[PDB]
Design a protein around this ligand. Structure first.
Ligand SMILES: CCNC(=O)[C@H](CC)[C@@H]1N=C(c2ccc(Cl)cc2)c2cc(OC)ccc2-n2c(C)nnc21
Ligand SMILES: C[C@H](O)COC[C@H](C)O
Ligand SMILES: [Cl-]
Length: 110
């Protein structure tokens, strides 16, 4: 990986670590629409994203730069903000996790 992608992988590891598990856990795996009974999810969300998919893409060297990585992580949060009411518990968790993401992403080495 490039230096910037290393930093991205570091952030990714952090997002998946125990210290953030209390609010990161909904984002660990792809939304299972049928299991959650949200039968309109895939009509509303055209591009599902989650941290296991980001991890797989990082491992497979799918991401060519930090920008592409960040777009996926942000897409994941956006999907949450799109589907759920602004006052929902899972949205609060998304906001907190994105705060973790954005502040460390900002420390990207040049
Ligand atoms: C119909 C109630 N809303 C939902 O089920 C959400 C839409 C699928 C769902 N809520 C959750 C969710 C709801 C309440 C709380 Cl406290 C935490 C997560 C959700 C749960 C999961 O369990 C494996 C996985 C993904 C979840 N997720 C994400 C990401 N974005 N929205 C959700
Ligand atoms: C809560 C907003 O949707 C995302 O905020 C990011 C900021 C760095 O906390
Ligand atoms: Cl972006």
């Amino acid at each position: 990986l490039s230096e910037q992608l290393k930093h991205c992988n570091g952030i990714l590891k952090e997002l998946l670590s125990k210290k953030h598990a209390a609010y990161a856990w909904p984002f660990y795996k792809p939304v299972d629409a049928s299991a959650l009974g949200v039968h309109d999810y895939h009509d509303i969300i055209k591009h599902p994203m989650d941290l296991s998919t980001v991890k797989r893409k990082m491992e497979n060297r799918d991401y060519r730069d930090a920008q592409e990585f960040a777009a996926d992580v942000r897409l994941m949060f956006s999907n949450c903000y799109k589907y759920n009411p602004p006052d929902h518990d899972v949205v609060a968790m998304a906001r907190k996790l994105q705060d973790v993401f954005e502040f460390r992403y900002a420390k990207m080495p040049d």
